[PDB]
Amino acid sequence: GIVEKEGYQLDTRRQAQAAYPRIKVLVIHYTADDFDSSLATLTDKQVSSHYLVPAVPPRYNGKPRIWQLVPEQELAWHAGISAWRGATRLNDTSIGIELENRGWQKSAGVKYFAPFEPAQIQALIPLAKDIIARYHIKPENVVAHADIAPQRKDDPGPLFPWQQLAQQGIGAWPDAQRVNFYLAGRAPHTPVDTASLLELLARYGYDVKPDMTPREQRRVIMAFQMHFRPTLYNGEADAETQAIAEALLEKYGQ
Amino acid sequence: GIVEKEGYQLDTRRQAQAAYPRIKVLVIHYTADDFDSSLATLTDKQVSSHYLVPAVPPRYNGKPRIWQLVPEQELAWHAGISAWRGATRLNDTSIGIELENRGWQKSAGVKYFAPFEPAQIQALIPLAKDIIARYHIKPENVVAHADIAPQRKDDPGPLFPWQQLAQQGIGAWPDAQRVNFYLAGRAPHTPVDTASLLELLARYGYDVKPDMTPREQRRVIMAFQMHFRPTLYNGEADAETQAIAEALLEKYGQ
Ligand SMILES: [Zn+2]
Ligand SMILES: [Zn+2]
């Protein structure tokens, strides 16, 4: 109809066809702290997120309770300096979901990660689906904080169940047959051209700069492996890593 | 309270402090067409805007009628490839207001622009203030499409009343005393270091690439001049242009 305003009125009878959501990405993080401490942090004037899922969510009426700290219409400070598929400032176009989880701890030199309680994951799935459906977020745009900030974050980490969620319609995941095909008859750990892999990763969305050190290049490859090749994420380019990138780019494009 | 959902419930009792709007910029354009044609275009599957103000808005109850084609919560396709103050894809974080106006036409070689009907401007002011206040948009973030896409657009053009609107609390505008001060005792048209100006413009928000042709450099300077130095926008760097940039950066930063 016609909305009355101060000094003018708005005629909303005519709606444009080019009208889409400002929200396109869903970022998963881990708090690396206990619930109360995470809650206090994510609610202070420095960092925040849209959701905070506890390690073992308190059940009410057969449903787990997830905290919401920021309205989805507003942006939260959870991504920081970031870049993904050609966009920067991901806080602007994304929704951040913090999962209570210790993250990693160097125990005997071996930087070990903390597994995710199945309860937490089960509570996340429903949430992720509402968000994704509510803004038609594409599978490749459901990312790890590490994916949009490879040089600074690892979260949610190698122990986060990306495949499990994919089979639930959440997140991008290659196709077995396609991954093998692209392997081109090579051992999964067969060394590959680093640069050729980085090219595929940049095309998939990873922030690859045209002048990175071997350390930075490993970071990008590593973050990619913690997501889609958790069995080994040393940041070394090999057949399987490249075979997975090719299948992902083939199924999700760029 | 506690919101009930499918498979989980949301506890919104705890609100984070870091919660801000995703909308930060307001872009002004001209349709370069009549109302009906502009309306048909801005509502088709290719381009659109959040608002369409007619040359002479139809009054109803003493108030002009402005059309709204896209909800402010959604993004519209009005900015295209763009960049401003470090951000790209301005469609994501902005609101676009199309003003019915012919734009420019080369009459006798002299590319002439079409003045803006005072009625249209009077209807715009109220609108712009609600938007700005509704998301606390900063003055320097109320821009010309040309400002975020210097190499492609001129709109709203040199005839658009930016100073008039500024005095109304809409848009950034230097301070007389400060502009003179920075002139450092020089004729307003005194030639200045092109590169030194481009640096100030890049710091203010203009997309300056580290390898532009003289033509592209003139575009950036020109777009800047059509906005803040409409008396002359030849894309040539001179005392006044630089003196204005310095006063703007001094009063709005970056
Ligand atoms: Zn994170
Ligand atoms: Zn425009």
Curated annotation (Swiss-Prot), chains A, B:
GO cellular component, one term: outer membrane
EC nos: 3.5.1.28
UniProt: substrate binding residues: Y30, T31
Domain of life: Bacteria
GO molecular function: N-acetyl-anhydromuramoyl-L-alanine amidase activity; N-acetylmuramoyl-L-alanine amidase activity; zinc ion binding
Location of this chain's protein in the cell: Cell outer membrane
Site (Transition state stabilizer) residue list: K153
Main location: membrane
Record has Metal-binding as a keyword: yes
Membrane topology recorded in Swiss-Prot or TrEMBL: Lipid-anchor
Name the record gives this protein: N-acetylmuramoyl-L-alanine amidase AmiD
Key words, A-Z: Cell outer membrane, Cell wall biogenesis/degradation, Hydrolase, Lipoprotein, Membrane, Metal-binding, Palmitate, Signal, Zinc
Annotated family: Belongs to the N-acetylmuramoyl-L-alanine amidase 2 family.
Record-annotated N-acetylmuramoyl-L-alanine amidase domain positions: 21-158
A Pfam family matched in the record: Amidase_2
CC cofactor: Zn(2+)
